[PDB]
């Protein structure tokens with residue numbers, strides 16, 4: 001089947017606030033993962049058509065990627081920091097659902113998740 005449209009990243013009707021937690025999520029957490037050797041397979045939605053991935057968007061009905069997260073942070077899409085943390089965790093979980101344990105993409109996701117947890121350990125208080 002065709003790829004779905006990407007997740008929404010901006011909504012002018014959503015209320016906007018800046019918090020220490022959201023700032024840290026963009027400037028520390030996202031930034032660190034984005035520059036990692038293994039960021040690139042996660043920097044945009046999975047193009048399952050081009051990659052010929054069987055049934056990808058039947059298996060993965062809550063897709064998420066770091067390009068979407070980055071835009072959401074930049075557009076003040078998130079009100080609560082937990083919304084952003086949940087999006088990262090959805091991305092990791094989705095990788096572990098679709099792909100065999102120990103395969104290359106899974107090892108890349110695990111390396112990014114380890115870094116994510118290191119940085120989240122120092123998230124500012126609410």
Ligand SMILES: Cc1cnc(Nc2ccc(C(=O)NC3CCNCC3)c(F)c2)nc1Nc1cc(NS(=O)(=O)C(C)(C)C)cc(C(=O)N[C@@H](CCC(=O)O)C(=O)O)c1
Pocket residue numbers: 040041042044046047050051053094095098099104105
């Ligand atoms: C986030 C994510 C999750 N799950 C997957 N599952 C995949 C993906 C690919 C394959 C694959 O190619 N299997 C071969 C053919 C069938 N038999 C076995 C060998 C696979 F089996 C599973 N992939 C995700 N992300 C992702 C992965 C990859 N490649 S990869 O092999 O996993 C690796 C080199 C190890 C990272 C590429 C991109 C990507 O975005 N590439 C281009 C645009 C697309 C294009 O040009 O075709 C870009 O960078 O823009 C993204």
